[PDB]
């Protein structure tokens, strides 16, 4: 995107409500000009 | 400010990223220095000679 490499991924978090259920989050990270990642 | 609008940020770096994929020779070029940014809200440009 915008001629830059990004990594997009889905993560799962376990939550007690008892009963077990899950929370989901999407994360996005990218390469900076010096080669490090954000 | 009253009737004036002052740009506070820049989008240059975002457009630079794509140009930058070819290296320094592009980054520091005159073409790069001619990147345009969006106008500050409703309005228009005009020439007065």
């Amino acid at each position: 995107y915008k001629s830059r490499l990004y990594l997009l991924w889905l993560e799962q978090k376990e939550i007690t409500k008892t009963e077990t259920d899950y929370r989901y989050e999407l994360k996005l990270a990218h390469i900076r000009y010096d080669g490090t990642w954000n | 400010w009253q009737s004036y609008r002052t740009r506070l940020n820049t989008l240059f770096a975002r457009q630079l990223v794509a140009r930058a994929t070819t290296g320094i020779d592009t980054i520091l070029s005159m073409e790069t220095q001619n990147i345009q940014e969006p106008q500050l809200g409703k309005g228009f440009y005009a020439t007065f000679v």
Side-chain angles (χ1 to χ4, degrees), chain B residues 22-38:
Chain B
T22 63
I24 292 168
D25 294 347
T26 300
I27 291 167
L28 298 176
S29 69
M30 184 61 68
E31 186 180 63
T32 299
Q33 294 176 52
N34 283 278
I35 288 169
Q36 298 182 334
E37 296 178 291

Side-chain angles (χ1 to χ4, degrees), chain A residues 8-24:
Chain A
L8 181 69
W9 67 96
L10 182 69
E11 298 191 3
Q12 178 176 277
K13 294 190 178 82
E14 185 176 325
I15 296 173
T16 299
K17 293 182 175 177
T18 68
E19 64 182 5
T20 300
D21 202 342
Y22 298 88
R23 173 173 171 82
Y24 298 87

